Design a protein around this ligand. Structure first.
Ligand SMILES: O=C(O)c1ccccc1C(=O)O
Ligand SMILES: O=C(O)c1ccccc1C(=O)O
Ligand SMILES: O=C(O)c1ccccc1C(=O)O
Ligand SMILES: O=C(O)c1ccccc1C(=O)O
Ligand SMILES: O=C(O)c1ccccc1C(=O)O
Ligand SMILES: O=C(O)c1ccccc1C(=O)O
Lengths: 285, 285, 285, 284, 284, 285
């Protein structure tokens, strides 16, 4: 259930995020506040786009800072069928109007990402695939928390949250260490026993070498589907312990061709780099 | 000229921004650094998407913090023809690898935005229009600086940077003040004489009321082009002092329809909410 | 009207300000707390200086942070006739005594500035002048928010809040650009369309060049009143669109000589650089 | 005065400077395009008499913005207007970005140093050897500059904050239920490394405070005719106890408050009513 | 000890708590889904002997996380294991989020307070009335908890930081060119509200330091046989000067350093080598 | 290899740490600086305790901020035989004396922890045991980075760095979930696929349940050694995939009794909670 995902959020990081957003939007005097005054008011939140609602905790934390309350008519994760009345916000008029843009901006993006994740999860399910659709570290700097949380709301896995969550050996590591085996052995020796090591591999030879040197996960990078499945099949046969991830150029359109019985995870840069924001408005009534 | 735009950037805000992005990506121990080591290294930056290059100052600031140096082979604002060698980065291997994803993320989004901005400016120029294409406050919270700067690099105007740069009376302010004239009179009385007042108007009646009560700018919100131009024409005839801005549902496709001799400014949420990130990579060699 | 001015204040910036002032005054252990104890207490706030009361929202925020409550016997902006009971503060004794000095310091300076502002407004009104008395950027660093707010409470305009609110071309910009016309044309081309451009001019020739190149405001800097008024008169006659501001060595004493029918704004460094703080005390009873 | 810069906590200085620059320009700076990045030079002019103070702040502001400063007058010099005080060099837009915050800081620091030197001069002129001191009546957020200014003027800063000295005031006396209870509580609570000072509005109080173990007694709001007899008796009975006078002391009445039994005279006016000096920065 | 909480600067406290929680969980907390948000209650167990200290920190951690705490023992109580000390309440995932950081803080605060109480007790048992004290030998970033723990245990904290007292050390002596130059420079530089203490490794230095106007003289690394004759002479000729002993003082040798002419005994061990107490927080 | 471990450190978090330490030790004026002056000076760093040298990167960062340089005569991780000359520090006198205590405090605690870790690793090696000696999250709040680093320099594994690095089900999670199986199934479902799940088990029955429900690691908590090894033996025989950790009341003295062939990891709170600081001094010469 998506309603439970809010529990994941670090509250100290949340509060600081919210403050820095409001500071960004209004660092000094807000002259518009005299236009609206402090009279108690109510505003309706409208969804004008189809997709998945995500970002309630952030929307709430923005408005709570500004002494406003929110009532949701749809739970976190609901399908959105425009034009829908999603929520009501109450508080002093200038407070509502001060938070409006930042709150809509957050909900729009979080919902945009959750929508793209859900479409990808749906296409995979429709192709018979049971594994994890996942995001990447291709997130807007400073805004990871919202973006990874959006992915989760959409039913995708977030993948490692940051550099501290998993040790990922990539092409650049392989080059710097002087070869796949040296890179993986160094990664394995260096990584705390609590961490997994994943290795980005551009061929089957690399993947085998990586599995032999102790990789927990092998990421098959930029394979055409026709070489991908035979590669994953062998790896799973020779190394059934190793998880297999596919990534590189995977889109909502081609995703079903990348699904296969020997792929455990499919990760997509597009879920965060190319998810258009949903359209929401907040109309004072 | 785009190479000069870096001078606009508040350096204190920049350095803090860069810190907070690196803190977001790696808050604790970075075990991968043992895989690469500290040996001096070089990496090529590759452009794999068409569009406009934007974000050099951010990319530089990230790598300078990490004791790396960057050489650009393309000036800020260049057209990108993939696959193009854009830059070279140099530093200790683990520093390069630490900054890579955050640097590419920033460059990708900034460039994505600038690209969409230039496409919009090109379509307007091609429909004979001389005014400003502009952005909005529909930006990713915490990342406005990069986004507004991207718009500038693409030849669009940024529009007000935040709530302190202009007083904008919107449908919500109109509702709260109890009507157009009350809202605008309160905005004008409240705003420091150094500020302009702009008024969002959904009809010609509103626009006239707003001009009469002293608006510097009138924004015609969500007009079909057929109603937009007659409205603008009347407004400019009666109130030649008043600048006219069009906004609402304007896309790269329909933009030429919204250009007209009496529109001074066209603003587009899509330039920031729906600009896909460009594809860059940073390959150690 | 002054009771409504509190609405202008950015709440995130206010909270961090207050934190940082209390940190500055007591970074570590506060041994004096043990002398007072945590017994609920009450203190009276005394105004011992004539002038205008300003700064209630800062005084309140300091005490709220420290779990104390304040009741005002006088609204924000009231004339102060010493010795007057202005407020009651309640909370744990050690909390009251911890906040005392910072709260009095803030109210003293805010009130000092508001008083100088009101005296200036009064002297202008008495000389028949209708325009804006305004402050400058000559503010104590880190304290601008309290100083600009003080101005407003005293009836003066704040002028631009910071470098983002207006583009102001000064003698140094003229030098760096190579001449008045090049500076103004560069300012106009650079500034977002939402911003005004104001140009500091030391002669009537400069003012005409600035008005011709597109200035919204011309600031006549350091004129003796005898040269100022003819200059303003000409300017208004040729360029009735252009607002005219006088500034430089304007004091409460000479201010009536600087008022004239063709001056729109008079700005005074003294309102923030040389306003003595009012005398307040907070006596536990 | 040239050595006083050493006192400054560098971590606190850097953060101060950042927050001042952030305050003055949080977002895009369009004016930078008007000046460009060409190397430039600007002269610092002193247009007010008084004492120069605040070099380390001015330097720190300009170093952040990749500019350099050369001083023609050392910290603490007497200013005779119109004087060429310094030269600043760097990219034009950097100079102009730092200008106003740097002038604002030097103006206020110098203002305070000037009032402090005037007060030190008037005291010396009246034969007094004691310490002229400031108070905690400082602009919030700007104490570091203000206390430093006092020192450049030759005044003592007094306790820097609540953690440097335990000061028992009228309010503490009321809350504790009397002078003796307040002072005994202050003395028991304060770490042995700290002094205890007690604000006393009468001789009876001062005697009680001294008897209860005060290191300093601050005679608050005495008219000078009652002040000196009071200090005299105190010094005679309790020669260990330093005596400070404070309350309504001004540059004008200060010589009346000097006496052989006052050790310290503190003045709110040195920080609450010191006008800022006039400086400008002219690009040339 | 119940009143010591009032000493704590609330702004510094809140920021401390935030940074501890950020340190322990900067990103997503997947464990939260295992416990859920149902209301819950946990018992706090003391498994070590010693002195309980750190309640205000433990409370601030849990208050931030919307949990409440009830204490069954007041701050400063003797702990006899295994004792039920407190109950915590709140949403399950909030309790479990706070648990480790809260226990970490109480464990260390209590560890320090226990060592301090042991040291005060051994001194009292050897007839000594002076102050047992800490040093600046604290964990960086964690000074507030460590100094507060010292207080709860009955030791003095000593100067909180570099701003509380001016301390001339070996290294100042070398840099200034000798004891007298160092102490005269310290005295001239220090605001009149501050004391000056001087670290001395011989009687010669102690006398010189007293003569130059030191308020306190710290006899560093003396064997007890040389310490007491030195302190005796110092008190005889300079009764105004407080005498502190420090260096290699342990719980074991402490009684040999107590003497009628020692005012303060400071021990690095109270903070450098105090084992944390064992506490657990068991959901029931 | 200890000299390489410095690369693990996140540079942004490091710099912020160092700042906050210096701010804690001297928030306002430092009158002692006038006693030393600014003359260039040198100081020798002396080790007066046996054990292992750890913390150079911290010590260097402190001094670099204060414009001092450090030369090490012993590499990071060296055995310390007192009284040894470990390093030389150079810079202006007042800068050296400002950083001295905080630098010593850091080096002292880091080295203390590294010494305890190395003593533990030695005793294990001496009892024939090959597995990882590890720390815990029982670290001084705010100072984890230095403490986990110290562990690594002494040859111990750090264990998970924070709550983000691994999902650890403890007795409390078990009670809150309503049983071992429900807790582990919830942990696995909730944890991103990139994370491992470890389960604290106080009996063999729980350990079996945890392994069956999908635990990657089982932590045998508070076993007497006589019950431990037979439990581990059974567990390894039925679940060879599952790593086994022992923990609870393990000390340097009893550690060899806890080593065994079916234990992979032994973690010890004492390494961080009861490690006395080493004695170092810095003597200006
Ligand atoms: O962002 C990437 O390069 C990336 C792409 C796919 C999976 C994981 C990651 C990651 O770094 O966490
Ligand atoms: O964000 C918006 O709603 C917006 C849309 C168009 C122009 C300007 C703005 C603005 O608020 O600055
Ligand atoms: O501070 C100044 O120099 C100043 C003086 C007069 C008007 C405006 C300003 C300003 O820069 O905003
Ligand atoms: O600020 C005050 O009220 C004050 C006034 C005189 C001396 C000292 C102080 C002080 O508090 O430090
Ligand atoms: O930390 C020290 O070296 C020290 C040792 C003993 C007393 C006081 C201190 C101190 O500096 O506060
Ligand atoms: O700190 C603990 O309780 C602990 C004890 C042993 C291993 C790991 C941990 C951990 O939580 O990281």
């Amino acid at each position: 259930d998506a309603e439970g995902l809010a529990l994941l959020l670090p509250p100290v990081t949340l509060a600081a995020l919210v403050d820095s957003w409001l500071r960004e939007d209004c660092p000094g005097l807000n002259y518009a506040a005299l236009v609206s005054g402090a009279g108690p008011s109510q505003a309706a939140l409208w969804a004008k786009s189809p997709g998945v609602l995500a970002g309630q905790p952030f929307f709430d934390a923005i408005f709570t800072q500004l002494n406003c309350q929110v009532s949701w008519f749809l739970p976190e994760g609901s399908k959105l069928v425009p034009v829908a009345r999603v929520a009501e916000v109450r508080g002093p008029a200038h407070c509502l109007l001060l938070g409006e843009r930042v709150a809509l901006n957050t909900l729009a993006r979080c919902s945009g990402i959750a929508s793209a994740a859900a479409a990808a999860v749906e296409a995979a399910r429709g192709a018979g695939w049971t594994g994890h659709v996942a995001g990447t570290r291709k997130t807007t700097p400073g805004f990871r928390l919202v973006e990874k949380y959006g992915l989760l709301v959409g039913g995708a896995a977030s993948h490692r949250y940051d550099l501290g969550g998993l040790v990922m050996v990539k092409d650049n590591h392989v080059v710097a260490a002087g070869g796949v085996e040296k890179a993986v052995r160094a990664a394995r020796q260096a990584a705390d026993f609590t961490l997994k090591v994943e290795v980005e591999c551009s061929s089957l030879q690399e993947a085998v070498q990586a599995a032999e040197a102790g990789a927990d996960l092998v990421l098959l990078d930029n394979f055409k589907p026709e070489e991908l499945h035979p590669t994953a099949t062998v790896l799973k046969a020779q190394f059934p312990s190793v998880a297999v991830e596919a990534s590189g150029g995977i889109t909502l359109d081609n995703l079903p061709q990348f699904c296969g019985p020997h792929i455990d995870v499919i990760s997509m840069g597009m879920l965060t780099q190319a998810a258009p924001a949903l359209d929401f408005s907040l109309k004072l009534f």
